[PDB]
Write a protein that binds this ligand. Sequence first.
Ligand SMILES: *[C@@H]1O[C@H](CO)[C@@H](O[C@@H]2O[C@H](CO)[C@@H](O)[C@H](O)[C@H]2NC(C)=O)[C@H](O)[C@H]1NC(C)=O
Ligand SMILES: [Mg+2]
Ligand SMILES: [Mg+2]
Length: 242
Amino acid sequence: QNTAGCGQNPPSSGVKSINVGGMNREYILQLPNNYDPNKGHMLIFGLHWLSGSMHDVHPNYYGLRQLAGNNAIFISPNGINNGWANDGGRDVNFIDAILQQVRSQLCINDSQIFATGFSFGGGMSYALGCARANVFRAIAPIAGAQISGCSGGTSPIAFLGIHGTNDDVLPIAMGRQVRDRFLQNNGCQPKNAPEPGWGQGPIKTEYSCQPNYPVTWIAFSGGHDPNQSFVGREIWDFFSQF
Ligand SMILES: *[C@@H]1O[C@H](CO)[C@@H](O[C@@H]2O[C@H](CO)[C@@H](O)[C@H](O)[C@H]2NC(C)=O)[C@H](O)[C@H]1NC(C)=O
Ligand SMILES: [Mg+2]
Ligand SMILES: [Mg+2]
């Protein structure tokens, strides 16, 4: 169902400021080229990595911007200390604040809200899938790990995990642990997910789960780097299936 901001005169795209429990925080809002205020848009959060900032995820949003057409509104939130430590849920609360604001301003389809990010941003996407399975339709950690916490974490939510076999910063076992939680939550039949050899193309495993909560795992042969040609395409195809 569509939000109250449908039919409202839109704000400008750009850097936004927001008060989260007394803390001034910032995010980039990026509206589509053609913004129809009467069409319910996808809302896609892209979450940066440690030492990076919201200015690194904008303007390409992990390859999604080039493929999303006018279907999506993009958010690039800025982490405190250039990370997503999420102490006591403060970063989940930050996302709650953005959601409350943009849902009242923009035309969003509440069944099409998504989160993706690399490394620390993958941990934060995981933390949102754990605590906000009511809000998010799917998450897609890229080289993710349990580094932003996981409060709750028993509800099903559609999940796409992408990880490199040669990642020496967050080893792929850490990403499998994230994946394995939603294999359980989403009622997926156990199944071998092979992973590519050196110099071999990525291997996508699509698990058999409850058809509303699919799980997909894509292992590639590289390292701690989200800039693989397949990333934007695969995340877009996963998010746009709903
Ligand atoms: C909001 O998104 C939902 C889910 O993507 C849309 O509902 C789907 O619409 C397609 C085609 O119209 C159907 O094949 C699906 O079965 C629907 N799914 C669900 C869960 O309803 C919906 O049309 C979008 N727009 C609004 C205004 O709700
Ligand atoms: Mg990081
Ligand atoms: Mg379009």
